[PDB]
């Protein structure tokens, strides 16, 4: 269904924040 | 639909505060 | 529907968001 | 409807979120 | 409803959010 | 409900965000 | 259901986040 698929594309969004965060706790630590 | 729409909308803003988290982590490492 | 326009305010709240998070770059690099 | 509202509830926190968002940025440049 | 509790409880968990958010900013500031 | 029961463990993971985002407010305090 | 698993997915990304925002507090910290 549409709004399965748009919520799966917040889901997918949210572990690209995720990524980011992980780099941020990366460019810290250096 | 209106509500896939808007819930496709609220992933686009997540994929942009993402950007705007990797710009951050750069701005960290630089 | 009530349901939809309250989806796309969290969309919005959500490029307010990011807005502020670039914001956060900038200073950090400025 | 009550699902509505809770909906509005949701952006009003994503607003101060962002608020919050805000005055990091600005403490970062001073 | 369930469905809407649920919705409540996840603006109050981005309240607390915000307050941290807040937090964050005082402590750079200070 | 399934629906009901995912949204409150989307509740649960934001108050553990929130409980980061204090330890974050913390850290830069100390 | 396809909803129900979708919401999950966010929980999920969601748990990701406070992960990482843990490790961002970690290394401010040290």
Avoid: S, T
Avoid at 2 to 12: G, M, N, P, S, Y
């Amino acid at each position: 269904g549409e709004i399965a698929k748009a919520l799966r594309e917040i889901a997918k969004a949210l572990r690209e924040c995720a990524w980011a965060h992980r780099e941020i706790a990366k460019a810290l630590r250096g």
